[PDB]
Amino acid sequence: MKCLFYIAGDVSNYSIVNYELNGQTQNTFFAAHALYNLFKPDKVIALIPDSLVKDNVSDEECYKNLVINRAKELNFAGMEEFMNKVEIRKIPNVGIASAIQCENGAPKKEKNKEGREVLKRLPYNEKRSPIFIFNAIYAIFKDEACDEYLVDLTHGTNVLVSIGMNVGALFNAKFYSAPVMGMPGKDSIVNIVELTDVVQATNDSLMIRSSIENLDERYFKDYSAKLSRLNPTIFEEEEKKVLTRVKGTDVNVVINFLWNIRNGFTVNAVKSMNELKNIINQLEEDLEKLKSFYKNWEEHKNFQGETLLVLSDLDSTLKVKDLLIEGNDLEKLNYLLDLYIKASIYDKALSLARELPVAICLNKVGGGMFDDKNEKYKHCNEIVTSYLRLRYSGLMEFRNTLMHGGLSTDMKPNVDKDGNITPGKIVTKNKIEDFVKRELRNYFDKIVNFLSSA
Amino acid sequence: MKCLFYIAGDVSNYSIVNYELNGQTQNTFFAAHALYNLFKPDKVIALIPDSLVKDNVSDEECYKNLVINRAKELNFAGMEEFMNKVEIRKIPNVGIASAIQCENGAPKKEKNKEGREVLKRLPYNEKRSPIFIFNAIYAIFKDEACDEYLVDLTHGTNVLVSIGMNVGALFNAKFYSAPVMGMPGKDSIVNIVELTDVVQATNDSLMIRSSIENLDERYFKDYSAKLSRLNPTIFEEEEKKVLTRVKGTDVNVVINFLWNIRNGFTVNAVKSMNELKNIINQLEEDLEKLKSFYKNWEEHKNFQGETLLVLSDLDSTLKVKDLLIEGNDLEKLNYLLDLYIKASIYDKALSLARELPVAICLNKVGGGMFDDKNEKYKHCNEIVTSYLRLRYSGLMEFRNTLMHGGLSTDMKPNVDKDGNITPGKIVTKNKIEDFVKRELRNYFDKIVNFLSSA
């Protein structure tokens, strides 16, 4: 079931216009109705700020009438069957504001000196926390028990619109706003902007940045499809050049790189680091071009209506450069070890710390396969394992524990007659954390320094 | 290098008022100015929207001057360090607007019937995608090469303020807005809201929800400290009882649960399932109370200045319920197995898939410790290990491969004298993904079904 939320703003000012989206318009005066008529939401929620409108009796009914009174001053069609269905929720606000009074069920008047006016004279000053407003709006949103969320940010302060945005963001809301910018009077058409793609673009980028940070590809948003269907109707020879370049950037290689690093295919990931260096070096110059293009945006108005191309998605992808290093595969794996310590992926860091000295040893002796049939390996492993069980006894103990997990001979849990397990060792969250993140890099360098002589 | 970013909008309608924030009071008509004084930003970016100014040779100074002209008009004592040391950048806009048209510095006046205010252009056919505006603003933000980002959203349209916020979110920007809404009058005590916490609150919630989805405590934002310093001054008894309840919710248990699930301490993760069922059941009722509190926010005006309590942080924590099940530790580990398949954590799923049948066997034979000294275990393991080596050759091969990783005897890579390494048995991302996510559960159930007979 669809749900449409809107910010009340002020209905007394604005007039009749032609609100349009997707080549379809509506004959109305207020933003909310145009969207309502086009989308057919099962519920419609109004957000009355505590400042604007104060009835004493029922602020909920006062606005309900304030709307009908502006409909009858322009003699509009319908808007009465609409009003019955709308739920009206009071929302807080902050700062000085033009607060209008309400006598019992309708706004009182106020002759003033010349014209005709309502009650609006030094009616509001209030200091609030925006998180309070946030919580209040969140509460309303949560309790509506909606499936599809639709938000109208047309009216209301930059503070309420921004707050309303962040709330809606947590309900996967489609955001809409009609840029007013004064008033056209009658016979003017207004285009409703959709601010959902901008909100997704930013989450996508924050998530993509953590994929790299925490070596986890499950957080990387695959904008390959966004790029594949990206093809505007009008384009110059310089912009067609760069858009064809961006359209074919191998994002899947970046995703695969993360998948290998995550699942511990350390050898495969290290071989790629060169391919990726080239992928991101091409993306860097594609992006620098796209940047001067958007820095001098007025010369390039072709992208003016294009949605699918978003800089943040690509720029956030360039962070994968932080995962690459130059050198031989052994030097690349050495850096990968550090990366596994930085992101707190303890198990992969330990296995790499314990096996990398064997591959180092195998290089010193001219090379060989990581097989028990290989003589060079057979002894290299024996030296590492033994020097490794003589000193650095702890490293192996941890690596083992983490490899097998809680349900294993290394943890010695006890299964009872009934079906309940009682552990046999204590999960030392802090000696793992402390050992890996502090001592282990030193314990590896000390090992590697020892086998250099070999 | 601190960089203050703000939307100029119109300076002609700004009254000379006073600004307060964190015990510091600066008096300027526009918020940016005030913000400059107390923050002392190394750079100041004006972000001039295209619609509000229109000049032939270079409008970037038209505004430059529009500001200076409104300063000398009411004889401002400051503006010296601000002006001539402020950058300006041209930014796009949507809908219908158009305003101030200028020559070579200063705005063009008009007489009409009565008055002497600047003639504003009326047509504004600018239909452009918000993502375009987003990219254009992003470009400006990226290229300033700033360390600390500060954004002023007090000025600007609901579309620009929202777009500006999503950009500023990607630069770890402290957001500020001075709520006006109507004419406030010269020399008015107006304070500026900080929206940074609302923007963090939402990212924190999206991340917390992911931490639960992907069984990764690295994504869980620990709001324990936020909750520990949460002490409002005036609070009614009903408010104090509920706030003391929330203030002492064991978020660390939720974090620990995720840390164990992530690092494969499967027994401990399952043991604490019951504790957490109670933690979240207590949180559910605290949250339901906190909800009606914020639904009837007009009655709980004690929290209106409170910034440390955030509903979204707690509500997102309730998602951890999706990780819990009821039953004996064996039934609890069985669910944990599927959770490991759902989140694509292949390594832990396989280990649990292999060892869980052993513990299942151990239960049938009256119980025993997961030690080689235990006879019941010794043979249970032998049956499990053999049946898999017999019927499920595959599982045992993948489990082994993932435990040791690419650089090991299970992958057989080969080291060269140069140090270049080539992967051996080379296993594909889709071989693993498909096996685990498709055939792995059925294969477990088949093993489990067999050992029931034992």
Author numbering:
A (entry chain A), B (entry chain B): 1 to 454
Tell me, in the authors' exact words, what the paper reports.
The SisCsx1 monomers are curled around the two-fold axis to form a dimer, and three of these dimers oligomerize through their HEPN domains into an equilateral trimer, thus assembling into a hexamer. We show that cOA4 binding activates a cooperative sequential catalytic response in a hexameric SisCsx1 complex and that the RNase activity is switched-off by Ring nucleases, which cleave cOA423.
A cryoEM map of the complex at medium resolution was used as a model to solve the phase problem by molecular replacement in an apo SisCsx1 crystal belonging to the P21 space group. The Cα backbone built in this map was later combined with an iodine derivative of a better diffracting crystal of SisCsx1 in the space group I212121 to determine the structure of the apo SisCsx1 to 2.9 Å.
